Amino acid sequence: KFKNSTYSRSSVDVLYTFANCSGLDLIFGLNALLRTADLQWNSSNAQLLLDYCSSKGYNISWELGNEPNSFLKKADIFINGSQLGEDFIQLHKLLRKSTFKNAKLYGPDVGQPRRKTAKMLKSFLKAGGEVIDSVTWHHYYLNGRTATREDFLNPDVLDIFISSVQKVFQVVESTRPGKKVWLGETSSAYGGGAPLLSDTFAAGFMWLDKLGLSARMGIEVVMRQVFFGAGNYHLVDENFDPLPDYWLSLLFKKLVGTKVLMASVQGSKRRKLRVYLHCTNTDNPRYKEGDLTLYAINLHNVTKYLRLPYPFSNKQVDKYLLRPLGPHGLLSKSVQLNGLTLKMVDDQTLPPLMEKPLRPGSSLGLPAFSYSFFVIRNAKVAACI
């Protein structure tokens, strides 16, 4: 079903320039199915690419293979974890002898941890784990072809991610303790997305919840499938228009800092109201050292009112509430921030993201089927300074 294709120096330059000019750090996946007679990785095509990139002064990080747990299905070739590990060691030797001898190497980009995948990951990390800078794995909640609207809103679907992350850390803790763990490819639904779902406001419950859980659980980097592309899980559609998940992603970047804290609901039912707490992003000029960013998802069909604990119950709070632009409700491709539709000013200009200051001492209103950020100003939290 998948055939080999070639790509050119030109394609490489296109990709690199896109990344470089957008301020992004490129990670390039190398082809792991080029095999010698004895089933070793044949590195000779990678060698050509490396020399080319070295010759252009390109600053690039590397991966080798994608979803190697599926190679049998996809290409009728089976590569066990041990061997894949040895293959990564060989890549690491080529990198060390190149113009960027300190380039980073990530892998093995396995699927989510079913029995056979967990065995492949464990054997890989025993064999090759010394040469990787982070461990990458992939996650999707659903199949794009069968996903329903209720699936995208169901806390029992959202909660399955938790056991996947636990299982990955169980494998990593038993083989390379302390090694950083990244989600190397992740989204709502595999197979290109679910249509009028993966590209709508409704997709944001899975995306924001995954970001909150990932940060809370010790995942260091989360790579969203895809920025731009054929699949409906794209952040930016075929006409170069941003979809709701783009705007959610931009707001998350502006408000959420690197230090992860914890929020939790007092009541016994913790399924439908989901809450996360970080220090406020220190690059945001509106806020100051010690401020907190809370974010919350309301999967109840009524408005909930959140009360902040002492010593934050009378602080000035800025609300950043996202809701769909009508008439299509959760199936909308347009979104409003505190009642103002989010749209590019022009092709070179993003809009400001405007807060709604709340009255000090008021509870935090979160409408049905919505998500919001809240910045607690003058929180003076020492852990954040």
Added chain:
Amino acid sequence: QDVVDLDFFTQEPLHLVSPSFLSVTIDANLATDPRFLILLGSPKLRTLARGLSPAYLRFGGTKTDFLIFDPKKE
């Protein structure tokens, strides 16, 4: 009753995420599109991409293992 009280832990950071915590991909299959150059050259698309910096851009997917580099191709 629709009022929910929160408990916060603020004593110390529980984890530290990368500044590039929210990163993105481009599927390797996009490189088979004849318009690859036109698409990633889009100034509008680069403006949107810049909005997410700092971030990793991972070029990868099923097609990763069916792509061969050809230094003679134009």
